[PDB]
Amino acid sequence: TXPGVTXPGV
DNA sequence: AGCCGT
DNA sequence: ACGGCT
Ligand SMILES: COc1cccc2c1C(=O)c1c(O)c3c(c(O)c1C2=O)C[C@@](O)(C(=O)CO)C[C@@H]3O[C@H]1C[C@H](N)[C@H](O)[C@H](C)O1
Ligand SMILES: [Cl-]
Ligand SMILES: [Mn+2]
Ligand SMILES: [Mn+2]
Ligand SMILES: [Mn+2]
């Protein structure tokens, strides 16, 4: 996720 | 640590 | 079949 906590996605 | 869609 | 950052 994020970043942080990419995306998702990307 | 933290999920999704080319 | 298989990748994206702080
Ligand atoms: C052992 O790999 C996996 C095993 C189980 C599920 C997964 C994957 C997986 O590798 C995977 C991905 O690599 C990707 C995604 C994904 O959901 C998974 C799994 O679910 C989603 C993503 O497609 C998008 O966000 C499109 O916008 C990008 C990424 O795709 C990669 C490869 C694609 N061919 C394309 O080049 C895309 C741009 O990046
Ligand atoms: Cl790439
Ligand atoms: Mn990990
Ligand atoms: Mn899927
Ligand atoms: Mn992977």
Author numbering: 1 to 5, 7 to 11
Per the authors:
We report here that the cooperative binding of doxorubicin (Dox) with actinomycin D (ActD) enhances the specificity for consecutive GCCG sites in DNA. In this study, we investigated the mechanism of Dox by combining it with actinomycin D (ActD), another potent DNA-intercalating drug. The structural basis of Dox-DNA intercalation has been reported previously, where Dox prefers to intercalate at 5′-CpG sites. The major mechanism of action of Dox is intercalation into DNA, which inhibits the enzyme topoisomerase II, preventing DNA relaxation and leading to DNA damage and cell death.
To reveal the basis underlying the preference for the GCCG motif shown by the combination of ActD and Dox, we determined the cocrystal structure of a ternary complex in which both drugs are bound to the d(AGCCGT)2 DNA (1.57 Å). In the crystal structure, an ActD and a Dox molecule are each intercalated between the G2pC3 and C4pG5 sites in DNA, respectively. The ActD-binding step (G2C3/G10C11) exhibited higher roll angle (3.7°) values and a lower twist angle (10.5°), resulting in significant backbone unwinding. Conversely, at the Dox-intercalation site (C4G5/C8G9), these values were reversed (roll = −3.8° and twist = 31.5°), indicating overwinding of the backbone. At the ActD-intercalation site, there are extensive stacking and hydrogen-bond interactions between the phenoxazone (PXZ) ring and two threonine (Thr) moieties with guanine bases G2 and G10. At the Dox-intercalation site, Dox has three hydrogen-bonded interactions with the N2/N3 atoms of guanine G5. In addition, a water molecule mediates specific hydrogen-bonded interactions between the amino sugar nitrogen atom of Dox and the oxygen atom of cytosine C8. The orientation of the amino sugar ring of Dox in the current structure differs markedly from that in previously reported individual Dox–DNA complexes. Additionally, the side chains of ActD and Dox are in close contact, with a C–H···O 3.4 Å interaction between the carbonyl atom of the Dox side chain and a carbon atom of a valine in ActD. This helps to ensure a snug fit, prevents steric clashes between the two drugs, and enhances their specificity for binding to consecutive dinucleotide steps in DNA.
